[PDB]
Amino acid sequence: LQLLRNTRIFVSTVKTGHNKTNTQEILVQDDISWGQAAEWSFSTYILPYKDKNTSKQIVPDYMLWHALSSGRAINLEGTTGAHNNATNFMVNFKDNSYHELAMLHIYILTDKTWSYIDSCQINQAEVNVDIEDIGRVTWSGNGNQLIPLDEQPFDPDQIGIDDETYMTIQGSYIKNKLTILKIKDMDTNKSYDIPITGGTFTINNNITYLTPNVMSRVTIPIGSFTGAFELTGSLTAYLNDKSLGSMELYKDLIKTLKVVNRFEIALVLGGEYDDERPAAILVAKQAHVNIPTIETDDVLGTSVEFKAIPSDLDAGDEGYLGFSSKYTRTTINNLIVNGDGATDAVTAITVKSAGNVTTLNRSATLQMSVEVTPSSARNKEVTWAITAGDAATINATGLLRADASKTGAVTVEATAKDGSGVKGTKVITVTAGGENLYFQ
Amino acid sequence: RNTRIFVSTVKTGHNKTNTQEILVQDDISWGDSNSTDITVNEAEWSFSTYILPYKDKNTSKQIVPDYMLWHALSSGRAINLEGTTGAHNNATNFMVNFKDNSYHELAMLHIYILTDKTWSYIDSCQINQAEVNVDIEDIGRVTWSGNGNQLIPLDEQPFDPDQIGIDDETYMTIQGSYIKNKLTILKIKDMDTNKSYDIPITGGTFTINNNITYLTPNVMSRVTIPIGSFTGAFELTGSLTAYLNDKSLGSMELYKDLIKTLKVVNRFEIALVLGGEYDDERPAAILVAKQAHVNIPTIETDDVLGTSVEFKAIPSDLDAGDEGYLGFSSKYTRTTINNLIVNGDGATDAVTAITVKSAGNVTTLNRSATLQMSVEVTPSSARNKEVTWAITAGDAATINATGLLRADASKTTVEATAKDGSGVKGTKVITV
Ligand SMILES: [Cl-]
Ligand SMILES: [Cl-]
Ligand SMILES: [Cl-]
Ligand SMILES: [Cl-]
Ligand SMILES: [Cl-]
């Protein structure tokens, strides 16, 4: 028996001196449970919008995203935890190696009565990717204790969401009923866009609470400790020739999965388009992906299980998130490549030769160069290789040297150094040359 | 929490006939899920259960452990499982129809709540709505929503919950009664053409809504108003997601023919079969709507994500209460599902084949001579074996209401169609 009451939830980093910097209202759904270590749970939606004061992309529950991801104090202008800019609101786990993550106090106003949960830790965020309910997040955690309050700890109307912001938030839902699991083998650069109809992904901190009231002579400086950071997903896809685009894509994906288990993935809630639209993205640069029944095409769709893995034990790079009300294919690609929608990734490389010559005599040298698109790209540097032929070699600085005796076509390849995997090529043919050579 | 919910038609004299335990899935809210509106302006409950059909030990009849909710949703009369309306059953299936729902107030229930050794009850409840889940991974979940007059705490137990409630033997039977086959089929049929299609459903819901309006209480009437609420328009609708392509239906012919029929046909006889249909006895829950409006707008456009299917069941006439009906069983087959669709009961045999006969087996009717035509209807157990008579691809023959056949003036095939509603036909070719 759950009595449904008019409830308002607020989270704070403080117990006194509450203001709009350290406290925020949380727009919880009808499913909200708490009791008594105290345990709590509630849901919200990923609702990205333009903050009026800063003009930056934000979510109305950013303090929860921060507390899930970091042990430091909030700094939206930084590069870790919850952080943002005019292109997107971001979250990363690079600053999560702490016994205790950033502490929150959950204030509950219900039927003119106040209470609060003192000293909370956000253990888990489960994100829904069901096409009919995209971006629902179920938050769960614990608190040291639930305490009734005799009066208002602060003015909820002042501290809470104002009418103007509430209306903006209500129009910020990810409404496009589509999710795409983008999967890329970084060794071959083979990519696939898998439509997702069902499932969830979970960010779990595996927190262990210490049994309180166990008398210690010297106070134990933590009330709990984080466990292994786990970023996983259990999805359902509609995988076949039609859904991927062609029978060759589908056959190539089956071939790839037989020999490749590690991929760079991106789960795009709301899909990706060339015009500015809302989306929430989860990126895992090195994920273990399992699609066992790929060759079985059935009405239940196909199971896709993933486990994001860090590069090193405590790198905190298992994955990261990006949310915006105005994402595009371009800024989603930026997020996937660089970790930020605002940081331009390389999109195209045109290889050029000195004088636009397509031939080169034996023993001569030819300087190659690149025209990298877009010019706003963060890192425009390239690596140089010969991918076809043997009549020339190339320097690390793109100086092509024709062999002194060999002849033939060579394919010069420039590859982006920024993680995009973008390549550009030029064919140069080494020619014999008119030099009057003689037998000595 | 360890909450136990019971529903009853009475406030005293509780027994196993008038009271039953309800196996609620996860809490009963009391604020919730589209309940009643309140007229003459100057409370809501909600919980979920599963459709769990099983054989009752005492009667050997098919039943569900929440039959009193199905009865209260569908009827204003007292419960009578041996009847033909509301919640009713037999050895083949548990059924629900809406033929006895033309009442201001439907059958009242009292919801008793035992939670942490503390009792309370919601006095005088109306079931406004039942929303049934057709998601392949959670088939047959029902979300019930309604209103009551007030929630009242109780100082002592109103009855012994262990005697009134579900016993260990029945509980175990119920726990093995889930519709486990992850498949749903929306069977649609154009009754004019007899063209039928089995559309696989992967998601959605159907809703049975009573549109109840509660009267604002504590309103001074000189003569007491004898109702506290009134039912509105009975609405049976669904919003589904179908897997509709060349391979899902069975062939590209079927898919192309379904697109054709939808462009010119809006009204169909539909059956939503939760759990699928097979030739061996298996559990299933079926919703039938004999006169439904069906809309699949993106049938062509959609290729492989999912196709929206919206339907609205419509009665045959005013106050008929025949918008649709339900049938549940732990042992349904395609044969007894077909009986439910045709006759409203899995136990009532529908016609499956008709062989057209003559006086003997004579085909030599040459000119202006009378010949009595007859039928051999299969199965012999069919309830209604009556047939209508017509002339299909006929040159100069005449047919009456009975089986009499004659061709006048030496001018130079006969078809029997079941009255039953099955649409089964049989023919015979005559010489002339
Ligand atoms: Cl800090
Ligand atoms: Cl972090
Ligand atoms: Cl936390
Ligand atoms: Cl040249
Ligand atoms: Cl030369």
- In A255-407, DSSP assigns E strands to 262-269, 277-290, 302-308, 320-327, 348-353, 359-361, 365-373, 382-388, 392-394, 399-402
Please tell me the distance from the alpha carbon of residue A65 to that of residue A47, in angstroms, as a whole number: 12
Phi, psi of B163 (to 5 degrees): -80, -45
Residues in Cβ contact with B114 at an 8 Å cutoff, skipping those fewer than 6 apart: B3, B4, B5, B6, B157, B161
| DSSP per position, A53-71 | TT--EE-TTHHHHHHHH-S
Judge whether B67 and B19 are in contact, CB under 8 Å. Answer: no
CB contact at 8 A, A91 and A65: yes
Give residues preceding each break in chain A, C–N over 2.5 A: 36
**Tokens 């020999």, located at residue:** A259
Give the C-alpha separation, B312 to B314, whole Å.
6
Report residue A265 as tokens: 């993935």
- C-alpha A57/C-alpha A429 separation (Å) is 51
- Decide if B207 contacts B129 (C-beta within 8 A): yes
- The fold of A348-431 is Immunoglobulin-like (2.60.40)
Q: What is the DSSP letter of B358?
A: B
Q: What is the resolution of this structure in A?
A: 2.2
Cβ separation B200–A240 shorter than 8 A: no
Residue A26's beta-bridge partner residues?
A: A9
Amino acid at A106: I
The three-state secondary structure class of A285 is strand
Ligand 3 centroid–CA A28 distance in Å is 17
- d(Cα A195, Cα B196) in Å, to the nearest integer? 31
Pairing of β A359-361 and β A423-431: parallel
Answer whether B28 sits within 8 Å of A2, measured CB to CB: yes
SS3 A162: coil
- A120 C-alpha vs ligand 3 centroid, how far in Å? 6
Contacts of A197 in chain B (CB under 8 A): 202, 305-306
**Cβ pair A3:B30 closer than 8 A:** yes
Q: Indicate the residue type of B346.
A: G
Strands B387-391 and A89-92: unpaired
Nearest ligand, CA of residue A357? Answer: 4
DSSP B24-46: -SS--EE---S--EEES---EEE
Nearest CA distance, A1 vs chain B (angstrom): 5
DSSP conformational letter for A194: E
Structure-token pair, residue A113 = 């009565």
Ligand 5 centroid distance, CA of A355 (Å): 16
Question: What distance in Å separates the CA atoms of residue A77 and residue A84, rounded to the nearest whole number?
Answer: 7
A38-45 vs A136-149, strand pairing mode: antiparallel
Q: CA nearest B160: which of B3, B27, B19, B66?
A: B19
Ligand 1 center to residue A71 CA distance, Å? 8
Ligand at shortest distance from the CA of A139: 3
| Chain A: residue whose CA lies nearest to B184 | A299
Task: Tally the C-alpha atoms within 13 A of residue A355's C-alpha that lie toward its C-beta.
Answer: 8
Decide the pairing of beta strands A365-373 and A348-353.
antiparallel
Nearest-angstrom CA–CA distance, B206 and B228: 27
C-alpha span between B20 and B18 (Å, rounded): 7
The first and second tokens of residue B136, run together, are 């392949």
Residues in chain A: 440
Cα nearest neighbour of A5 on chain B: B31
Q: Which amino acid type is present at position B166?
A: I
H helix or E strand, kind and range, residue A329: helix A329-338
Closest CA to B237 of B168, B292, B161, B160: B292
The answer to whether residues A247 and A232 touch, using CB atoms and an 8 Å cutoff, is no
Which residue numbers of B have CB closer than 8 Å to A's CBs?
A: 1, 3, 27-32, 44, 113, 115, 120, 136-137, 182-183, 200, 202-203, 243, 245, 248, 303-306
CA of A244 vs chain B CAs: smallest distance (Å):
10
Could you write out the DSSP letters of every residue in B77-132?
SPP-TTSSSEEEE-SS-EEEE-TT--SSS---EEEEEEETTEEEEEEEEEEEEEEE
A vs B: CB pairs below 8 A: 54
β-strands A277-290, A320-327 pairing: antiparallel
Of all residues in chain A, the one with the smallest CA distance to B112 is A1
Distance A338 CA to ligand 1 centre (A): 25
- How far away, in angstroms, is A239 Cα from ligand 2 center? 34
Neighbouring residues of A78: CB distance < 8 A, sequence distance ≥ 6: none
- Main-chain phi, psi angles of A336, to 5 degrees: -60, -45
- A393 alpha carbon – ligand 4 mean position (Å): 18
| B1 neighbourhood in chain A, CB within 8 Å | 1
Taking the centre of ligand 5 as the mean of its atom positions, its distance from the CA of residue A400, in whole angstroms, is 18
* Closest-CA distance of chain A to residue B2, Å: 9
Q: How close does chain B come to A289, measured CA to CA in Å?
A: 22
State how far the Cα of B231 lies from the Cα of B76, in Å rounded to an integer.
10
All residues of chain A having their beta carbon less than 8 Å from the beta carbon of residue B200 are 299
**Distance (Å) from the alpha carbon of B31 to chain A's nearest alpha carbon:** 4
Which residues lie near ion ligand 4 (Cβ < 5 Å)?
A 357-359
Separation of A79 CA from ligand 2 center, angstroms? Answer: 8
Place of tokens 């490389």: A349
Which residue out of B202, B241, B273, B302 would a mutagenesis test of the A interface target, given it has the greatest number of A Cβ atoms within 10 Å? B202
Q: Let me know: does B186 contact B201? Beta carbons within 8 Å.
A: yes
How far, in Å, CA of A148 to CA of A107, rounded? Answer: 10
Q: Which of A4, A132, A238 sits opposite B305 (nearest CB)?
A: A238
Are A242 and B303 in contact (CB < 8 Å)? yes
Residue A387 — φ and ψ, nearest 5°?
-95, -10
Burial A260-280 (b: 16+ CB within 10 A, else e): beebbbbbbbbbbeeeebbbb
Overall fold of domain B353-428: Immunoglobulin-like (2.60.40)
List the shell of residues around ion ligand 1, using CB closer than 5 Å.
A 72-73
A147 Cα to the center of ligand 3, angstroms: 19
**Separation of CA B272 from chain center:** 8
Instruction: Describe chain A by its helix, strand, coil percentages, rounded to 5.
Output: 10, 45, 45
Q: Across the interface, do A1 and B27 touch by the CB < 8 Å criterion?
A: yes
Q: What angle do CA A233, A238, A243 make, to 5 degrees?
A: 125
Which numbered ligand comes closest to the C-alpha of A70? 2
Rounded distance from Cα A373 to ligand 4 centre (Å): 25
Among the bound ligands, the one closest to the CA of A435: 5
Q: Which residue of chain B has the CA closest to A7?
A: B31
Q: Quick one: which ligand is closest to A433's CA? A: 5
Do residue A3 and residue B31 have CB atoms under 8 angstroms apart? yes
CA distance A281 to A295: 28
Would you call A243 and B182 a contact, using CB atoms and an 8 Å cutoff?
no
CA distance B377 to chain A (A): 38
What long-range pairs does A431-440 form, CB within 8 A, spacing at least 24? A431/A359, A431/A360, A431/A361, A431/A362, A431/A407, A432/A361, A432/A362, A432/A407, A433/A361, A433/A362, A433/A364, A434/A361, A435/A361
At B369, is the secondary structure helix, strand, or coil? coil
Structural contact between residues A390 and A322, judged by C-beta atoms closer than 8 angstroms: no
> Would you call A299 and B243 a contact, using CB atoms and an 8 Å cutoff?
yes
